[PDB]
């Protein structure tokens, strides 16, 4: 069985590495070739995808070589470079999530000052500062500590951070590098979700979303289920007042036009409901296209939930995939035999799995990312 276990580990490991590489490369290229995806959020996500790509290329394969062979066969120099690269990339990831969390925090708490300062240059210099700071914090201590103490205690065939010979040092470093950032991101997101928890955006977003549901419906249930809620949010959006210019009275021509547009909209919605009841569901979908026509005909009267959802998904992926290894670091301070080598391998592999899961958290949930993906994969 042991031979089959080795073959199985090599196969699933190469599969994970390949999926990670392909996904993150698709994200990076998609941002680089589509100017509609060249936003600050996707700059942060670009850096995150770069870190995930480095994890998928270097860390995964070399760790598989390590585990499968049973010792470190490459050498001390390559071991030092691999450790330094992995920890610098990990730290850059952590501070990247910190940058995303704080950026969203200032977006939701300072709308009058921060959005105007939120350009691609500021994001670029923040990302660059994150990478440089990570490299300065991690690289010299990993590469040259052996020269500082004057002896290399990493014996032949081993690969580990030398100054992590002490368990308490490793745990303290895990507090400075993992626990405090996770707490900070948790509090920041707490303020995000409490900030999002105004009405006009919810009604309009509901109406448009249900319109898209009617357009892409498969059976006779989704069309009506989106029709009734879309009409409810339509009337609730008609009763309220949008941000009108000059603050006009309810008897003004602008308000009367605003109500009239939703009158026509509800009328055509009821026509689509009629045609949906007679058995002409296809004509009800075309009638939904008509709803889009009149909606865009009267859309000048109008002008974040999915962004908060996406951020939460990324944060939860990181925390859930990275918590076991760090609690193994916590337990290792008082009982080293309590964590076998296999469990260490499992924690390492969850940390690496974070990079494979990341693209599915923000790219497979965005329409522009999907369209750019299919453009990249189609044969020209």
Ligand X SMILES: O=C(O[C@H]1CN2CCC1CC2)C(O)(c1ccccc1)c1ccccc1
DSSP reduced 3-state for 73: coil
Query: Quick one: 28 or 351, whose CB is closer to ligand X?
Result: 351
What is the nearest approach in angstroms of ligand X to the Cβ of residue 83?
A: 8
CB 203 within 8 A of CB 236: yes
What is the nearest approach in angstroms of ligand X to the Cβ of residue 18?
A: 19
- What is the separation of C-alpha 365 from the centre of its chain, rounded to a whole number of angstroms? 9
Query: Quick one: 49 or 211, whose CB is closer to ligand X?
Result: 49
Burial class (CB in 10 A: 0-12, 13-18, 19+), 188: buried
What is the nearest approach in angstroms of ligand X to the Cβ of residue 239?
A: 51
Query: Quick one: 125 or 169, whose CB is closer to ligand X?
Result: 169
What is the nearest approach in angstroms of ligand X to the Cβ of residue 368?
A: 31
DSSP reduced 3-state for 52: helix
CB 311 within 8 A of CB 146: no
CB 71 within 8 A of CB 158: yes
What is the nearest approach in angstroms of ligand X to the Cβ of residue 46?
A: 20
What is the nearest approach in angstroms of ligand X to the Cβ of residue 140?
A: 15
What is the nearest approach in angstroms of ligand X to the Cβ of residue 82?
A: 10
Residue whose pair of structure tokens reads 């770069």 in the numeric block = 50
What is the nearest approach in angstroms of ligand X to the Cβ of residue 149?
A: 19
CA dihedral 194, 200, 203, 204 (to 10 degrees): -120
Query: Quick one: 94 or 226, whose CB is closer to ligand X?
Result: 94
CB 269 within 8 A of CB 226: no
Pinpoint the alpha helices (H) of 240-340.
253-277, 281-297, 305-331
Using Cβ positions, the residue closest to ligand X within the complex turns out to be: 178
Query: Quick one: 86 or 224, whose CB is closer to ligand X?
Result: 86
Residue whose pair of structure tokens reads 């330094």 in the numeric block = 84
Length reported for the chain: 380
Other Cβ atoms closer than 10 A to 60: 23
Structure tokens at 238: 């008609």
Query: Quick one: 170 or 210, whose CB is closer to ligand X?
Result: 170
Contact positions toward ligand X, by CB under 6 A?
86-87, 90-91, 94, 170, 173-174, 177-178, 322, 325-326, 329, 348, 351
Query: Quick one: 114 or 179, whose CB is closer to ligand X?
Result: 179
Pinpoint the alpha helices (H) of 110-119.
none
Measured CA angle at 270 (ends 264, 276), to 5 deg: 140
CB 52 within 8 A of CB 20: yes
Structure tokens at 237: 């959006």
Query: Quick one: 276 or 351, whose CB is closer to ligand X?
Result: 351
């Amino acid at each position: 069985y042991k031979t089959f276990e080795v073959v199985f580990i090599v196969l699933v490991a190469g599969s994970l590495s390949l999926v990670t590489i392909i996904g993150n490369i698709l994200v990076m290229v998609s941002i680089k070739v589509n100017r509609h995806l060249q936003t600050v959020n996707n700059y942060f996500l670009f850096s995150l995808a770069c870190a995930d790509l480095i994890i998928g290329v270097f860390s995964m394969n070399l760790y598989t070589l390590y585990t499968v062979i049973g010792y470190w066969p490459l050498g001390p120099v390559v071991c030092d470079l691999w450790l330094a690269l992995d920890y610098v990339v990990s730290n850059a990831r952590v501070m990247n999530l910190l940058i995303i969390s704080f950026d969203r925090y200032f977006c939701v708490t300072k709308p009058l000052t921060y959005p105007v300062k939120r350009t691609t240059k500021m994001a670029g210099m923040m990302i660059a500062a994150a990478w440089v700071l990570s490299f300065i914090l991690w690289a010299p201590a990993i590469l040259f500590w052996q020269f500082i103490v004057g002896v290399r205690t990493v014996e032949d065939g081993e690969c580990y951070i030398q100054f992590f010979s002490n368990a308490a040092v490793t745990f303290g470093t895990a507090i400075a590098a993992f626990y405090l950032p996770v707490i900070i991101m948790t509090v920041l997101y707490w303020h995000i979700s409490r900030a999002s928890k105004a009405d006009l955006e919810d009604n309009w977003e509901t109406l448009n979303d249900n319109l898209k549901v009617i357009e892409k419906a498969d059976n006779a249930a989704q069309v009506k289920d989106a029709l009734t809620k879309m009409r409810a949010a339509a009337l609730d959006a008609q009763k309220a007042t949008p941000p009108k210019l000059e603050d006009k009275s309810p008897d003004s021509p602008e308000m009367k036009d605003f109500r009239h547009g939703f009158d026509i909209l509800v009328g055509q919605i009821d026509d689509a409901l009629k045609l949906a009841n007679e058995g002409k569901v296809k004509e009800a979908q075309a009638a939904a296209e008509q709803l889009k026509t009149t909606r865009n005909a009267y859309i000048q009267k109008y002008l974040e939930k999915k962004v908060t959802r996406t951020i939460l998904a990324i944060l939860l992926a990181f925390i859930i995939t990275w918590a076991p290894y760090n609690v193994m670091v916590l337990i290792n301070t008082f009982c080293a035999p309590c964590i076998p080598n296999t469990v260490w391998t499992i924690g390492y592999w969850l940390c690496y799995i974070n990079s494979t899961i990341n693209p599915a958290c923000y790219a497979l949930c965005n329409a522009t990312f999907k369209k750019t993906f299919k453009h990249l994969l189609m044969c020209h």
